[PDB]
Design a protein around this ligand. Structure first.
Ligand SMILES: CCc1cc2ncc(CN3CCN(c4ccc(C(=O)NC)nc4)CC3)cc2[nH]c1=O
Length: 350
């Protein structure tokens, strides 16, 4: 029987749950009889991204519905969807391509989780919770509720829930301090960069075995750059609720997981609207999508030399922006050092 703290054991059980992975695939309208969890592979996902790229080239060039049909059908051949004996919906627009690119990004983390469960050894004398914990190659410690770091984190949660995200409220259940093996070494060139910020990154519970094992990653070269607002990078928010929406929790599944990462932003490339960029302009280290609302800059505090933007939301003074709240994007995976993982209870008001 595991000697791991009970919150850590509950975390491992949550993230390695196979029925949750199947549920996530059904939510995507994936046909599990044709493409079960076990048959998902990086080469099939990468091929589907390439087809999505072809569909997008065809839509941006103003092709007809009759022209696009063959391209759209190719995507469904690679990733079989649950439509029985009916014609699947046509992928003939930017929105349809973006939704599919987002689904494939998730499949990449689901594939990692399942490959970890299937690729090791079987020993009945060991607690499977300890076996699965070791597969993450991440030290996970419970942060003491009465500590200085816990007070800072709870204040960040309490102060940055947007009024426009008021259909639910958040309750912090557990705060974990995380250290992925090799991440500190990888982060070393960026450890003293200016503008290092502690930012949020939400994801579905089914992504976390992938995130803890492999870290936050960028969609592969096959992925269409136009399927993401600021291109292919790692996206973060300074408002807890903006990132909590990416957990995709519901009344039927109200427990989510959210990360706090130290992000080396350096010289920010400030943008108000979509820019499907491949690379950053010379001298820039990140993109800052300018929101209408920002946490109050005078309330910014420091936690182990990193800026924590935990002030309540105020007007940024930015006009004519596509964004209600800020977002930060890095285009090199080495610019992120994951620090904390929070288990949240979503209390739905609807
Ligand atoms: C503005 C705040 C914000 C934005 C946000 N945007 C997207 C996502 C979804 N997430 C993107 C990365 N994704 C990949 C998985 C594997 C690979 C891989 O294996 N690549 C090689 N790549 C990509 C998994 C799905 C979550 C988000 N959370 C937030 O808080």
């Amino acid at each position: 029987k595991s000697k791991l703290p009970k919150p850590v054991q509950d975390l491992i059980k949550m993230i390695f749950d196979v029925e949750s992975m199947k549920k996530a695939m059904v939510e995507y309208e994936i046909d599990l009889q044709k493409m079960p969890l076990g048959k998902l592979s990086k080469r099939q996902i990468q091929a589907a991204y390439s087809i999505l790229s072809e569909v997008q080239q065809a839509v941006s060039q103003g092709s007809s519905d009759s022209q696009i049909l063959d391209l759209s059908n190719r995507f469904y051949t690679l990733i079989p969807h649950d439509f029985g004996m009916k014609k699947p919906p046509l992928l003939n627009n930017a929105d349809s391509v973006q939704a599919k690119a987002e689904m494939l990004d998730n499949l990449l983390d689901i594939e990692v989780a399942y490959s970890l469960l299937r690729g090791g050894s079987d020993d009945s004398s060991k607690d499977p919770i300890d076996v699965n914990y070791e597969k993450l190659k991440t030290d996970i410690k419970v942060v003491d509720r009465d500590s200085e770091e816990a007070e800072i984190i709870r204040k960040y949660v309490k102060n940055t829930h947007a009024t426009t995200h008021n259909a639910y409220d958040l309750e912090v259940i557990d705060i974990f301090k995380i250290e992925r093996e090799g991440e500190c070494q990888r982060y070393k060139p960026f450890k003293q960069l200016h503008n290092r910020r502690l930012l949020w990154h939400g994801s579905r519970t089914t992504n976390f075995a992938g995130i803890l094992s492999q870290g936050l990653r960028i969609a592969p070269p096959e992925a269409p750059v136009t399927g993401y607002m600021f291109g292919k990078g790692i996206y973060f928010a300074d408002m807890v609720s903006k990132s909590a929406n990416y957990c995709h929790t519901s009344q039927g599944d109200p427990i989510g997981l959210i990360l706090l990462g130290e992000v080396a932003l350096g010289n920010m490339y400030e943008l108000k609207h979509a820019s499907h960029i491949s690379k950053l302009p010379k001298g820039k280290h990140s993109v800052k999508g300018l929101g209408k609302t920002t946490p109050d800059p005078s309330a910014n505090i420091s936690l182990d030399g990193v800026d924590v933007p935990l002030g309540t939301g105020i007007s940024s003074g930015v006009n004519d922006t596509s964004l209600l709240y800020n977002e930060y994007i890095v285009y090199d995976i080495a610019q992120v050092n994951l620090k904390y993982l929070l288990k949240l209870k979503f209390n739905f008001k609807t």
